[PDB]
Short mmCIF file of C-alpha atoms in Angstrom, two decimals:
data_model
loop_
_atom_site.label_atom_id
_atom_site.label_comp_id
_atom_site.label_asym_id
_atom_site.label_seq_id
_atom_site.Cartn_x
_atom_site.Cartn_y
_atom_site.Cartn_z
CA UNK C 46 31.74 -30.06 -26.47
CA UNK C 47 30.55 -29.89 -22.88
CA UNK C 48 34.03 -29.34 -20.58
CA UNK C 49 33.89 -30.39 -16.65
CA UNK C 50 32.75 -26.64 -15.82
CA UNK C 51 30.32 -24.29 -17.94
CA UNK C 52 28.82 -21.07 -18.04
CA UNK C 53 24.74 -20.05 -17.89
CA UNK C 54 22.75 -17.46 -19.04
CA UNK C 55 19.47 -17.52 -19.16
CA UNK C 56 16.41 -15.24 -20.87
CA UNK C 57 12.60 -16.25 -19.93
CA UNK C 58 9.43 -14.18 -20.87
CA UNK C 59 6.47 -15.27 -19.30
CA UNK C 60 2.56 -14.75 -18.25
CA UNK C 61 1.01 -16.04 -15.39
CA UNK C 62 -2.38 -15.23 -14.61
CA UNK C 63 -2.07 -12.16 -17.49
CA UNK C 64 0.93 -10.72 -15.50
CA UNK C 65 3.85 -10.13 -17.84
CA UNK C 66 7.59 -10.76 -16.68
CA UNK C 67 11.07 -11.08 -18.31
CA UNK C 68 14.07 -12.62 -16.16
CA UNK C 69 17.34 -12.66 -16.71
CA UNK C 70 19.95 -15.23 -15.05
CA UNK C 71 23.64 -15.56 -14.94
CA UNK C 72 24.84 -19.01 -13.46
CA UNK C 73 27.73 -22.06 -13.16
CA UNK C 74 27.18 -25.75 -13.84
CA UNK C 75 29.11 -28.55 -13.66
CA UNK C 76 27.36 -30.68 -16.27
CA UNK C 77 29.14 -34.64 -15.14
CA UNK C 78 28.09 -34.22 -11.65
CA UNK C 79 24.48 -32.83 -12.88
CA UNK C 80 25.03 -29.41 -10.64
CA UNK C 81 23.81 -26.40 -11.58
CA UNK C 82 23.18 -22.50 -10.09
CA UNK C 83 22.62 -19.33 -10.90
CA UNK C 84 21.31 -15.71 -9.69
CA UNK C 85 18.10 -14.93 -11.56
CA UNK C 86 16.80 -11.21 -11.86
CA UNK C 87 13.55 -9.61 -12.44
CA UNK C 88 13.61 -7.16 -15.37
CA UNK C 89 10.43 -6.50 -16.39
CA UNK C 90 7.26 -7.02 -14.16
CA UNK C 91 8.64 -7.10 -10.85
CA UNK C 92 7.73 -7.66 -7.66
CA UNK C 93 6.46 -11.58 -8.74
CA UNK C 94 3.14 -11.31 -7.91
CA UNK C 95 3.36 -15.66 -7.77
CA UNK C 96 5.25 -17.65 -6.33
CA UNK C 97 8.40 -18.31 -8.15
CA UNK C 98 8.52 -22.20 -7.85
CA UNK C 99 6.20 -22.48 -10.53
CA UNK C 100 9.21 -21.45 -12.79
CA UNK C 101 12.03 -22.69 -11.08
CA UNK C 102 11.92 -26.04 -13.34
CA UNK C 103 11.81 -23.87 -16.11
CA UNK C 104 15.24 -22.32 -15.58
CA UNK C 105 18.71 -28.31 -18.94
CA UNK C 106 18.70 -32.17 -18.91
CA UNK C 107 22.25 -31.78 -20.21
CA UNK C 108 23.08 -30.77 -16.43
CA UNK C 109 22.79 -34.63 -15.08
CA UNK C 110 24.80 -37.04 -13.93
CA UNK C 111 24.59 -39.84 -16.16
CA UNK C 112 26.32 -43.38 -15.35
CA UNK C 113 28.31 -45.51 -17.49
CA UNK C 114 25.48 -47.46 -19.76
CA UNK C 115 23.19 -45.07 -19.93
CA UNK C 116 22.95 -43.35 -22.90
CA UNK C 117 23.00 -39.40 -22.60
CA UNK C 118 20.48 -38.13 -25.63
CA UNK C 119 21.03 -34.39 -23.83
CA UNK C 120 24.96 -34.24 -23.85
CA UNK C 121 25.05 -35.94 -27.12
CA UNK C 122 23.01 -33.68 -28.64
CA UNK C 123 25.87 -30.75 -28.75
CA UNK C 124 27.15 -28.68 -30.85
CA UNK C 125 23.68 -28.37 -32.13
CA UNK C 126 22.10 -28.49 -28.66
CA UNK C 127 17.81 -29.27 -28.39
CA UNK C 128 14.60 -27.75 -26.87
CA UNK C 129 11.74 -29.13 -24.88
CA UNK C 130 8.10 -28.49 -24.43
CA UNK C 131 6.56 -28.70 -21.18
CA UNK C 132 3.16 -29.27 -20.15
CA UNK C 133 2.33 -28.16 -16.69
CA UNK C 134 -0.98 -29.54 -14.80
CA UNK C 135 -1.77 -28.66 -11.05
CA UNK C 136 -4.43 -29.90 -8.42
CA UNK C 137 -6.39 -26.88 -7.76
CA UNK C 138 -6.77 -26.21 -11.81
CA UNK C 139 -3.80 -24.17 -12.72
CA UNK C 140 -1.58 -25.05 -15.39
CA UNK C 141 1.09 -23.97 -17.59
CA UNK C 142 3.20 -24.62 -21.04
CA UNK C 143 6.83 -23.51 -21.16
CA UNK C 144 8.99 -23.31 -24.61
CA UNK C 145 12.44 -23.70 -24.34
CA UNK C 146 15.68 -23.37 -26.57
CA UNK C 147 19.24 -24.44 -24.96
CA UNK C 148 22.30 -23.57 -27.40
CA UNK C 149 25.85 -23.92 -26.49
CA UNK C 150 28.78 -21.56 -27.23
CA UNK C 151 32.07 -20.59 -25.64
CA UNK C 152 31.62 -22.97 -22.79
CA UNK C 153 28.08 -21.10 -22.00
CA UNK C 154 24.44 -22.86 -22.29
CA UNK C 155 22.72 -20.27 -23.62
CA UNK C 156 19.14 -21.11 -22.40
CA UNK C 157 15.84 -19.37 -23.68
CA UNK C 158 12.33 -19.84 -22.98
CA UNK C 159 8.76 -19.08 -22.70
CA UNK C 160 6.21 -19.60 -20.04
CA UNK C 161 2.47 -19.33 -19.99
CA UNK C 162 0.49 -20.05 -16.45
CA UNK C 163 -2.79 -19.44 -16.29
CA UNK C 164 -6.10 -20.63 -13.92
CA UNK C 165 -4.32 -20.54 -10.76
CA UNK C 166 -6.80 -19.24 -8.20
CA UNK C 167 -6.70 -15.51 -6.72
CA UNK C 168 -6.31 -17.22 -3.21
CA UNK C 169 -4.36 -20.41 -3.86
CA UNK C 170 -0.70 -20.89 -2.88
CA UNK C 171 0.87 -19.70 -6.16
CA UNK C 172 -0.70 -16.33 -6.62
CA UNK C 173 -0.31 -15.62 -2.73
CA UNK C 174 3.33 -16.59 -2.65
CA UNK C 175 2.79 -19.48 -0.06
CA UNK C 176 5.21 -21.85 -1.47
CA UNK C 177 8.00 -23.25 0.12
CA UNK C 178 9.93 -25.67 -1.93
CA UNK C 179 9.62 -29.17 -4.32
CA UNK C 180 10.34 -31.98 -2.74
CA UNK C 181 13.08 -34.60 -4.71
CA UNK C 182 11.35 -35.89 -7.74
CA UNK C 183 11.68 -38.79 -9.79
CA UNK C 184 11.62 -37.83 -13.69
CA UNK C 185 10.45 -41.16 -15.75
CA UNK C 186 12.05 -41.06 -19.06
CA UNK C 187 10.44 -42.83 -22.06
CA UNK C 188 10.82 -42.85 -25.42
CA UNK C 189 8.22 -41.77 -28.04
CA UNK C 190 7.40 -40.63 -31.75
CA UNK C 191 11.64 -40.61 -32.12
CA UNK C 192 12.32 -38.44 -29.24
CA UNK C 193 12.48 -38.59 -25.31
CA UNK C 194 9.32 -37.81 -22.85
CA UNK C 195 9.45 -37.34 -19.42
CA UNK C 196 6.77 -37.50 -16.54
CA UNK C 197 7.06 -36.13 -13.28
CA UNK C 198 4.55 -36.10 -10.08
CA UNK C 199 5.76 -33.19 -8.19
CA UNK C 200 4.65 -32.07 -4.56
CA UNK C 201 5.16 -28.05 -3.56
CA UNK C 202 5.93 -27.97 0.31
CA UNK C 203 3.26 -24.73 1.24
CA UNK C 204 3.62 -22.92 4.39
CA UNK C 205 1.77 -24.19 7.18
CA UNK C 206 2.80 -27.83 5.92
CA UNK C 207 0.76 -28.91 2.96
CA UNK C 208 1.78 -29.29 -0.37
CA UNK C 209 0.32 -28.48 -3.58
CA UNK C 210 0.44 -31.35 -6.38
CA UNK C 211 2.08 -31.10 -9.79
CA UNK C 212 2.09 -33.78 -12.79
CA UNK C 213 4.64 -32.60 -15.15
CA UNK C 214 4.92 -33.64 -19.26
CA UNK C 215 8.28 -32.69 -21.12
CA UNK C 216 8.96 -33.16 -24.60
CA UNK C 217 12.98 -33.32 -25.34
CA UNK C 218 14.02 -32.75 -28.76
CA UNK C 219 17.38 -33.27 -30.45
CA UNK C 220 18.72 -31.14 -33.17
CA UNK C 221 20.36 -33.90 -34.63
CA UNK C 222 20.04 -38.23 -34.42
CA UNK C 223 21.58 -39.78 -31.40
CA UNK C 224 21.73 -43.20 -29.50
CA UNK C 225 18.43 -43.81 -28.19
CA UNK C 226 18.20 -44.44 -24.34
CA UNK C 227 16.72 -47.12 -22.94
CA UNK C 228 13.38 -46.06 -20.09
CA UNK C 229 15.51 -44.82 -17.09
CA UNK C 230 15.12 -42.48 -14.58
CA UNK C 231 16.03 -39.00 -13.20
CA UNK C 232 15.72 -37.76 -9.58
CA UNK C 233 16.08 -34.18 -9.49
CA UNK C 234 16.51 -32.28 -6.14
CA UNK C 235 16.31 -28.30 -6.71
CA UNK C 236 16.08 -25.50 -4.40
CA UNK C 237 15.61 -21.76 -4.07
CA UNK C 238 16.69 -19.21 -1.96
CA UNK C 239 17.39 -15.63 -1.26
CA UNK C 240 14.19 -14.78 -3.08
CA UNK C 241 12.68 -10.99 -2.84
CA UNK C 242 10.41 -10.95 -5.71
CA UNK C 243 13.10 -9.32 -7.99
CA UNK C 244 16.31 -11.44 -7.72
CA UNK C 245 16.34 -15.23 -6.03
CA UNK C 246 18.91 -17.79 -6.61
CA UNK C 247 17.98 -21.45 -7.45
CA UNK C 248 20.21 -24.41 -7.46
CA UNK C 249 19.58 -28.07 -8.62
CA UNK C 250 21.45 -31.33 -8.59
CA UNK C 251 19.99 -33.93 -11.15
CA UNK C 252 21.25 -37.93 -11.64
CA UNK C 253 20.56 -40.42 -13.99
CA UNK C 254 19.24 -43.74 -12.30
CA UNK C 255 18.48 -46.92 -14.66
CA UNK C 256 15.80 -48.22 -11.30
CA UNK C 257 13.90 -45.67 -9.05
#
């Protein structure tokens, strides 16, 4: 169901701070060495009037290398594919919820979502575009009411060499029973570049770790 290479196109609407937006992506993965890209572009809404690291995460656990023992709830999941919830909580009193739906067909994830940011301060480094990049992160995955949780704590390099502090909640649903992993770990290292405020290009690599 998922072959060595794949396709990825992506919808998102969004709000953040009451400003409306709709992206469309195109990308590439290759899902067994948890690598992903893609070329993202503004549609509705643009220039991004925040910075666009605050939905960078947004835009597929499924995308991860997992090792042998392991099990994958995100690969096993397809045909019928799952969706996650995301909660979103930020030092300075900005937060944010995303929805989103990931579907597989013709060798394409076919990912769709929603995301809602609000409280992030008129002069803070997300509304002024001040935001650099996240460092590596260390997703701890858990298991809970029959499906898989993970929580992040997230650090946004800012120009002038601070960073800005994240704790991020996911909810990952399957659309069907699978094996259950044990608690394990994901390290997730994902960049962006070549960003204008209309089109930018983001790529991550992701791996499954069973300590740290």
């Amino acid at each position: 169901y998922i072959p060595d290479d794949m396709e990825l196109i992506f919808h998102m609407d969004g709000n953040v701070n009451g400003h409306y937006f709709t992206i469309v992506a195109t990308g590439k993965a290759k899902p067994y060495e948890g690598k992903q890209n893609l070329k993202a572009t503004v549609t509705k809404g643009a220039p991004l009037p925040f910075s666009t690291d605050i939905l960078s995460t947004v835009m597929n656990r499924g995308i991860v290398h997992y090792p042998p023992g392991i099990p994958d709830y995100f690969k096993q999941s397809f045909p019928e594919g799952y969706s996650w919830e995301r909660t979103m909580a930020f030092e300075d009193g900005g937060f944010g919820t995303v929805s989103a739906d990931i579907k597989l067909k013709d060798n394409t994830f076919i990912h769709t979502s929603m995301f809602h940011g609000t409280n992030f301060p008129a002069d803070g480094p997300v509304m002024q575009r001040k935001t650099i990049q996240w460092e590596k992160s260390i997703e701890k995955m858990t298991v809970s009411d029959g499906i898989v949780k993970g929580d992040i704590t997230m650090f946004l390099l800012l120009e002038g060499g601070g960073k800005y502090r994240a704790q991020f909640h996911t909810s990952y649903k399957a659309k069907k029973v699978v094996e259950m992993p044990q608690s394990h770990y994901v390290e997730h290292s994902i960049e962006r570049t070549n960003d204008d405020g209309t089109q930018f290009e983001l790529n991550e690599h992701a791996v499954a770790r069973l300590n740290e």
